[PDB]
Write a protein that binds this ligand. Structure first.
Ligand SMILES: [Zn+2]
Ligand SMILES: [Zn+2]
Ligand SMILES: [Zn+2]
Lengths: 187, 126, 546, 79, 490, 97, 98, 85
RNA sequence: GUGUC
DNA sequence: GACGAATTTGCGTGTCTCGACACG
DNA sequence: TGACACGCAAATTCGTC
């Protein structure tokens, strides 16, 4: 839901589905194709916005289908470096914290959280924050949490492709504690 | 597949909201729910996206108010990208203004900050 | 977790084909296993493959007692792997001999620089660099350049006299240098002659023999003079730099082909195996690779190493052509073997024998008989043949009750199907072992069903001695229980049948796209005049005329 | 835009169009005619051509690379 | 020229210059002369970057250009001039061993900028030297120019062809003038170091060192003197030194050496009556003159290099047979063992191992129009030229492998390196503010044992490889001087 | 006219067919295979498969007769459909600094 | 296979191919030579034209540039036979749309 | 005539070991001289360290990008007149 | 190899 | 008068020299 | 056991030092 990217690909229409409009068909089979798929570096596709220009169809001898090469713009979720967003924390780990978005269900913050964070999981998941300049503040974070506002940095792109003969998180983000949710910010 | 331009036509979240609201209301009337998993993936994506958008207090703003607020903020300097970065969330607090622009201490003054603050509070409802 | 986008099935076409020769380094890079053993079969419990051998199962399976090793599969989904064999002494090639004797004439043998002038090199290069170049214009350019390189015997870059280059024997190169003329005495030949008497005080049987002592280029000096040639003058030498390179002309690393390309013969006679001639030649040349490495330590003279070297060199060159001319009688084998070009060259080859032939299925042939009770585009097919032949078709909304009745009829009756295929899962099921009453109901839209030959089919009928294009035609099929071929006598002249000993053949199109193409072009009503002159060929015969 | 090609329908294109239509009708395609009770969609593929109800466009390519669009209904069928 | 030199210069221009320029540079070695548009087309690079690469290559006098058929400009890259970038440290050291830091810092910037004016050399040398001193920052321009004149009159830094249509035809003259300076604007005069002079000096050094450790320490002073009088009259191609007599030699001998006339003639005749045959006397009953032979000495040097290579690789017993067959040309297989007392088995083994590596040739002598490998005579002979030319092709791939190994280890411990170097600047600026030993124990234990042990080995490995590189490229220089002398431009 | 458009009067033999046509595997499928294949490997040229024999061997439909043209499906299609107008990106509003 | 004693088929030689060529039919000529005789699906690479396996190359050791095509088994056998004769048929793929 | 079933190693252990190098104060002087020549010509304007840099979105941090772009004067007078940047 | 077209 | 250069002609060598089916 | 297109090579003539 951040950047709309233009793409081009050939889409074959079934020979029995000729009663529906070619535009409606193409739009439906391009919505079904790129629905919940992650790509190399552009990001994660969400849906289809619209087609720009539609070329003619070709009937190759041998199959009998209809191939059309159309340019379409799909909405991909790819934020930039200095962007603040809110999330609901899934759980805690001794290495960062595991938080999720609405659809994107994998982001984890590293130990770089605050000035005095302490982590220890004896039986449950605990994140405590000590803050002493001249008075005493103790903030406690347990099994679940909501409304954490942070900046998404250290973006990583890993590709999964079959290595060797054919006989797992493609998108990775971290967060810096900015505004834990009373409200106490961090600068 | 081939890509003409990788990063192009940076859009907003309300545009996605408006596009996904009318996308599913006509899909359930027309669609036969024929392909189970292929349609299930799209349904899940759209549902999670619309839920995240509806939890975001930015759905009660039609495009004309967006255009008016953008023309109002066009006035001073702020930034092309920080324009919609500031519109993505509610800047009601003065601390979030300091985090919107990475350096908001030397460029302008805080009085002009509360000015645009009340300008935005007069724009978005609650 | 989220799934990554991936292309469903990569479907592409072939644009063009490029030809090129590989290097031993790339050969080893592609190769999988290195064969060092000559023992084909291990002398243990049963016939079993020996590891690191020529008949190994790591290059691909050829029979059905053992699975594959690289990727677990069977003989259907297995393409093949290659191997590399290192040779002790580099050897000559059988097809790249003319290229080598031409390059030896072009480039020097003392400096490794093409003998041309700076002003002529550019006037050849700009003519070479043209937007339009055919394969014949480069055939004559090498011819034109070899002439100017052979006119001059003294190079302009350095000051050494080369001589000339001609071949001798079968695979032997003698560079004619140190010529002794009777006009003036050259200092180079003088030093050459003074350099030889320093050893003719032990054996006085070479002073009558040194007068024709010259330079004999061996593969060791040839391969190294191909490594000192500049890459600048290669584009002018008419050699594609991206495909090939001048050094890659001497074989020193042999590429073991896949094992699926050389199937083994089995006998129900003696519990016996029979290998391919390629495998036997490989086991014979590997035994020559180990007999030379033993003699250097064991201690041999120059000639006893030289004849083993050139034997190993000739057995590798006779492995591809295998019909080379000018072989010494002591080296000539008496029994005949076929090589790599013998699979290509010949009537029973692979170019016009397999590729052009490609024997067809769903066909037959039977003696013809007269039947003046049919039409011009009709032919009678026996029921026994119609029961064997099947035609696959997909079930539409109009073909539901028409093929349900046929599958209810059965395979033993003439109108009916034998194999049934499902819509999504592509697998065929018999109609003789299973029940027909239940599969008739179990039918969906878009199901392939192969039924027997029915009346009203575009079926091809022809003869074997085809000279003109009207020797093959397409008619409508008709089932008649007489166990013989029948057709009208008027169309006997195009086939030129004599109706006493003629056995004509018949073909059945399988795809629907070709069933409509043989009806409009190869039609009996359409094809009535001949393209030669324009006269109608089908009018009448003797009896009707009388 | 003016056509520089003969208007008569060739048999080479007639056969290929008939084959394509026969292969497409057997793919559960919407028929462009009310057919009689009869199988072998090849037999009814000629019926649509005789009535000029075939939605297929013929693209003729020239040696240089020029494309020419022609309609099956615009072509003249002679037999 | 070949794939080895092209692969070497590719890395040499990728580590010295940039990737874009080295691409066009390597593309200019596969095709001799090509138009600018055709180059920009087939290379795949845009026009601006191609022009940048071309002007970079021209500024370092690495590529030449000529006017062709209509008005076109054909560029040509010479690989021999490119392969001389591995001897820059040796050139600077040879300039610094005779002269002082003046000549070193004058010539080290002439090879990093190619065509440069002397007003710029004096400028930059003066600036750097004033910045080097602490209290007295006074550097005379006259002493900087004095070493420049010493280079100019000894023929070390010459003038490149100046400016005398689609382009201008650069012309060269014999006007090596030194325009009189004006020290606190002279344009159109650029100076450049002369490399053949350095090659001649290295040849004299090698000759005198060989004749030193060969026979005597004193006769090398005499030959170096005989090689000092001919620096002006003799050139590189000339195989025979201009004739010189003993009476003129006794005039110019070192100041700290008192050797009389007849014993000097004694030394000279001992140098003449010598199997090495470096100096040859042509005289009379009265007197005469001596002439130094350069080619027959370079041949001996290359021969000694070949025997050293075969002795280090194969063995001393094997080099013994190599020298035995080099002495007795065209010897036969069974008669080599009656000379060399070596067991027949491993003798034949050594002979075949040598011949299978292209170290020896075998010549055929048949008695029949048929080859008849049985009924023929084989003879073993040695060729010096081809062996030197084939070792030269090995040295280049050796240097290429060394460079690839040196560049390989840097990119696995790279982020570790610029991360440990980033911690260096954190405390380097902190120590200026105030020294905290607690912030020192922070960096004492912040780096782990394998985090600090990697640089320790990497520096040693890089040093070893860069030190082997020079010992290898001196051998190619000693080997390329014997190949070019026998080569006669017809 | 087949043996005169080149400029020389050719005959239909192995040498004449080697001169009139330009395909490697085609010339190899007529007479000696080793010579033509080795010459092609030595030269190292590229061959665009467009002959009937090449298209039959490799498996491409030959572009002679029925394969000379291309069929196009005629259905309800729109080249340039009306796209959704933007409410955010209009550059006369988005003025850079 | 050859012969009736082993239940073989019929042979389609060149003289009968000339009759189909003179007519001008390309669909049936390809249907009864490639579709009904030997239809094989092979895979090669775009970087370097070579016969791979399981969508994987042993020359580049990467499955990025991998594609497939339909070829008769005879042609693939001829390619695998010629590659052992120092004759490598470097192939260049393309899209049928291209 | 014996047969080997286990293939030889890819690195056959050599006959003798390599030779140690010669070292003098001039040798490490030349080593450091080469190590500084490489680093300095890596930091020269002639060395093109700018192939092309792509930037998708513009940021506000434009202060820490003040790179000094001083090309050397190409001296077009003593240069091919056809080539004009 | 034999037999037929 | 005598030597380097280019022309015409006898002689050496390689490739195939239609298709199809059936049986032992 | 016919077909002639390729090389390979020796006899011979115009020409200029
Ligand atoms: Zn396998
Ligand atoms: Zn030469
Ligand atoms: Zn690959």
């Amino acid at each position: 839901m951040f950047v709309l990217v233009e793409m081009v690909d050939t889409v074959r229409i079934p020979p029995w589905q000729f009663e529906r409009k070619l535009n409606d068909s193409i739009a439906e089979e391009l919505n079904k194709k790129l629905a919940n798929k992650v790509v190399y570096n552009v990001g994660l596709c969400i849906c289809l916005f619209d087609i720009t220009k539609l070329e003619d169809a070709y009937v190759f001898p041998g199959d009998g289908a209809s191939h059309t090469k159309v340019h379409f713009r799909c909405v991909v979720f790819h934020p930039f470096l200095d962007e603040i967003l809110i999330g609901k924390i899934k759980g805690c780990s001794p290495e960062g914290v595991h938080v999720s978005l609405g659809f994107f269900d994998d982001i984890l913050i590293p130990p770089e959280s605050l000035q005095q964070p302490a982590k220890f999981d004896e039986a449950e998941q605990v994140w405590v924050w000590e803050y002493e300049t001249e008075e005493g503040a103790h903030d406690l974070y347990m099994d679940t949490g909501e409304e954490i506002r942070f900046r998404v940095v250290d973006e990583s792109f890993v590709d999964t492709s079959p290595t060797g003969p054919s006989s797992e998180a493609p998108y990775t983000l971290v967060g810096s504690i900015s505004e834990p949710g009373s409200w106490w910010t961090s600068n | 597949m081939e890509v003409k331009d990788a990063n192009s036509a940076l859009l907003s979240n309300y545009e996605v909201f408006q596009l996904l609201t009318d996308l599913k209301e006509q899909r359930k009337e027309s669609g036969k729910n024929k392909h189970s998993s292929g349609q299930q993936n799209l349904n899940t994506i759209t549902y999670e996206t619309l839920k995240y958008i509806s939890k975001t207090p930015c759905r009660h703003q039609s495009p004309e108010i967006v255009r008016e607020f953008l023309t109002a903020l066009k006035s001073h300097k702020l930034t092309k990208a920080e324009k919609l970065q500031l519109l993505n969330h509610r800047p009601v607090t003065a601390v979030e203004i300091q985090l919107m622009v990475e350096e908001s201490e030397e460029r302008l003054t805080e009085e002009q900050i509360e000015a645009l603050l009340h300008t935005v509070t007069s724009i978005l409802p609650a | 977790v989220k799934e990554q986008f991936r292309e469903t099935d990569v479907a592409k076409k072939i644009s063009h084909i490029c030809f090129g020769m590989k290097s031993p380094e790339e050969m080893r890079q592609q190769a999988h296993i290195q064969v060092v053993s000559k023992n084909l079969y291990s002398q243990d419990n049963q016939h079993a493959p020996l590891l690191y051998g020529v008949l190994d199962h790591r290059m691909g399976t050829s029979e059905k007692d053992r699975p594959c090793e690289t990727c677990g599969k069977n003989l259907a989904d297995c393409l093949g792997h290659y191997g590399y064999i290192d040779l002790e002494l580099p050897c000559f090639h059988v097809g790249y001999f003319r290229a080598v004797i031409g390059i030896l004439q072009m480039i020097c043998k003392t400096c490794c620089h093409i003998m041309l002038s700076q002003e002529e090199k550019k006037q050849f290069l700009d003519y070479l660099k043209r937007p339009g170049l055919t394969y014949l214009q480069k055939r004559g350019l090498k011819k034109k350049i070899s002439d100017k390189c052979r006119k001059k015997n003294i190079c302009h870059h350095c000051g050494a006299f080369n001589g000339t280059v001609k071949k001798c024997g079968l695979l032997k190169i003698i560079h004619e240098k140190y010529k002794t003329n009777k006009k003036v005495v050259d200092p180079i030949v003088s030093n050459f002659l003074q350099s030889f008497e320093t050893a003719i005080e032990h054996n006085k049987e070479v002073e009558p023999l040194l007068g024709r002592a010259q330079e004999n280029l061996n593969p060791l000096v040839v391969l190294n003079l191909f490594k000192r040639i500049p890459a600048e003058d290669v584009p002018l030498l008419l050699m594609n730099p991206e495909a090939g390179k001048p050094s890659d002309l001497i074989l020193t690393r042999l590429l073991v082909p896949p094992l699926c390309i050389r199937p083994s013969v089995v006998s129900d006679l003696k519990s016996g195996t029979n290998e391919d001639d390629l495998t036997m030649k490989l086991t014979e040349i590997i035994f020559l690779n180990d007999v030379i490495k033993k003699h250097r330590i064991s201690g041999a003279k120059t000639q006893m190493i030289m004849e083993d070297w050139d034997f190993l060199q000739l057995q590798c060159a006779l492995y591809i052509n295998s019909e080379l001319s000018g072989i010494p009688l002591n080296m000539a084998p008496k029994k005949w073997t076929r090589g790599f070009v013998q699979r290509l060259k010949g009537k029973q080859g692979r170019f016009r024998g397999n590729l052009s032939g490609k024997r067809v299925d769903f066909s037959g042939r039977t003696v013809i008989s007269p039947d003046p009770n049919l039409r011009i585009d009709e032919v009678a097919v026996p029921v026994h043949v119609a029961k064997i032949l099947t035609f696959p078709e997909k079930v539409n909304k109009a073909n539901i009750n028409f093929l349900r009745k046929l599958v209810q009829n059965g395979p033993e009756v003439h109108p009916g199907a034998n194999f049934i295929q499902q819509r999504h899962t592509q697998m065929k099921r018999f109609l003789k072992y299973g029940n027909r009453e239940k599969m008739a109901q179990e039918l969906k839209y878009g199901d392939i069903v192969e039924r027997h030959l029915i009346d009203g089919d575009v079926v091809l009928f022809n003869r074997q001695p085809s000279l003109h294009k009207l020797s093959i035609m397409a008619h409508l099929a008709r089932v008649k229980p007489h166990r013989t071929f029948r057709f009208n006598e008027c169309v006997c002249t195009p086939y030129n049948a004599d109706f006493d000993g003629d056995e004509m053949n018949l073909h059945l199109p399988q795809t629907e796209e070709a069933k409509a193409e043989a009806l409009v072009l190869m039609g009996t009503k359409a094809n009535l005049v001949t393209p030669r002159n324009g006269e109608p060929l089908i009018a009448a015969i003797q009896d009707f005329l009388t | 835009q003016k056509r520089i090609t003969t208007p008569y329908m060739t048999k080479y294109e007639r056969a290929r169009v008939l084959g394509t239509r026969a292969l497409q009708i057997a793919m559960c395609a919407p028929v462009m005619v009310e057919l009689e009770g009869e199988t072998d969609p090849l037999l009814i593929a000629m019926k649509e051509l005789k009535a000029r109800k075939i939605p297929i466009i013929i693209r003729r390519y020239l040696p240089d690379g020029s494309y020419e669009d022609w309609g099956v209904d615009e072509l003249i069928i002679t037999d | 020229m070949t794939q080895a030199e092209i692969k070497l210069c590719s890395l040499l221009l990728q580590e010295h210059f940039g990737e874009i320029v080295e691409k066009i540079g390597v593309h200019l070695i596969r095709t001799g002369s090509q138009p600018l548009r055709v180059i920009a087309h087939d290379t795949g690079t845009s026009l601006d970057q191609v022009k940048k690469a071309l002007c970079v290559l021209v500024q370092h006098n690495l590529v030449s250009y000529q006017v062709h058929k209509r008005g076109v400009v054909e560029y040509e890259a010479q690989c021999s001039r490119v392969l001389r970038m591995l001897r820059y440290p040796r050139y600077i050291y040879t300039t610094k061993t005779l002269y002082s830091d003046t000549g070193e810092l004058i010539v080290e910037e002439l090879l990093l900028n190619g065509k440069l004016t002397m007003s710029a050399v004096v400028k930059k040398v003066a600036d750097r030297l004033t910045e080097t001193m602490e209290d007295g920052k006074t550097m005379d321009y006259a002493e900087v120019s004095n070493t420049f004149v010493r280079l100019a009159d000894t023929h070390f830094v010459q003038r490149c062809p100046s400016v005398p249509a689609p382009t201008l035809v650069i012309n060269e003259k014999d006007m090596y003038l030194v325009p009189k300076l004006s020290l606190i604007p002279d344009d159109g005069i650029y100076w450049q170091a002369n490399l053949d002079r350095f090659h001649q000096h290295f040849r004299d050094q090698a000759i005198v060192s060989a004749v030193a450790n060969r026979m005597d320490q004193t006769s090398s002073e005499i030959v170096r003197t005989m090689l000092r009088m001919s620096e002006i009259t003799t050139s590189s191609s000339a195989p025979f030194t201009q004739p010189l007599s003993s009476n003129e030699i006794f005039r110019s001998l070192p100041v700290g050496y008192n050797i009389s006339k007849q014993v000097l003639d004694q030394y000279l005749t001992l140098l003449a009556d010598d199997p090495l045959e470096f100096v040859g006397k042509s005289g009379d009953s009265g007197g005469g003159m001596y002439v130094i032979n350069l080619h027959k000495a370079l041949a001996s040097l290359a021969t000694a290099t070949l025997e050293s290579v075969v002795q280090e690789r194969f063995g001393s017993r094997c080099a013994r047979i190599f020298r035995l067959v080099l002495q007795k040309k065209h010897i036969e297989q069974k008669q080599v063992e009656d000379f060399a007392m070596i067991p027949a088995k491993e003798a034949k083994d050594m002979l075949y191992k040598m011949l299978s590596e292209n170290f020896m040739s075998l010549q055929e002598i048949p008695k029949t129009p048929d080859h008849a490998p049985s009924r023929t005579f084989y003879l073993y002979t040695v060729n010096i030229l081809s062996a030197a030319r084939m070792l030269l092709h090995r040295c280049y791939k050796s240097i290429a492998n060394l460079i690839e190994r040196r560049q390989f280890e840097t990119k696995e411990n790279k982020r570790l390196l610029e991360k440990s170097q980033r911690v260096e600047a954190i405390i380097a600026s902190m120590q200026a503010t105030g020294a905290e030993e607690a912030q020192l124990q922070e960096i004492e234990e912040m780096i782990t044992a394998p985090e600090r042990q990697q640089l320790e080995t990497l520096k040693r490995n890089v040093n070893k490889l860069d030190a082997s590189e020079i010992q290898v490229d001196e051998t190619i220089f000693l080997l390329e001087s014997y190949i070019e002398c026998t080569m006669k431009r017809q | 006219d087949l043996m005169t458009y080149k400029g020389e009067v050719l005959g239909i033999t192995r040498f004449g067919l080697a001169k009139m046509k330009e395909s490697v595997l085609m010339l190899a499928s007529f007479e000696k295979t080793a010579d033509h294949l080795f010459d092609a490997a030595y030269f190292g040229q590229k061959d665009s498969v467009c002959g009937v024999s090449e298209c039959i061997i490799m498996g491409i439909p030959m572009n002679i007769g029925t394969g000379l043209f291309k069929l196009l499906h005629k259905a309800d299609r729109d080249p340039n459909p009306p796209k959704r107008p933007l409410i955010f990106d209009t550059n006369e509003f988005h003025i850079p600094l | 296979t050859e012969g009736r004693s082993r239940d073989g088929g019929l042979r389609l030689g060149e003289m009968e191919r000339d009759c189909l060529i003179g007519y001008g039919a390309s669909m049936l000529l390809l249907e009864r030579l490639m579709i009904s005789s030997d239809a094989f699906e092979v895979d090669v690479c775009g970087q370097c034209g070579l016969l791979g396996y399981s969508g994987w190359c042993h020359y580049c050791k990467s499955s990025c540039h991998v594609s497939s095509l339909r070829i008769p088994y005879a042609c693939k056998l001829l390619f695998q036979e010629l590659q052992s004769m120092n004759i490598i048929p470097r192939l260049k793929l393309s899209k049928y749309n291209e | 005539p014996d047969v080997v079933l286990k293939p030889p190693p890819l690195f056959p252990d050599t006959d003798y070991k390599p030779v140690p190098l010669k070292t003098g104060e001039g040798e490490e002087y030349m080593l450091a001289l080469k190590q500084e020549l490489r680093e300095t010509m890596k930091r020269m304007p002639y060395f093109i360290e700018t192939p092309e840099e792509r930037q998708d979105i513009e940021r506000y941090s434009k202060r820490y990008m003040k790179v000094y772009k001083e090309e050397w004067i190409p001296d077009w007078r003593r240069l091919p007149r056809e080539m004009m940047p």
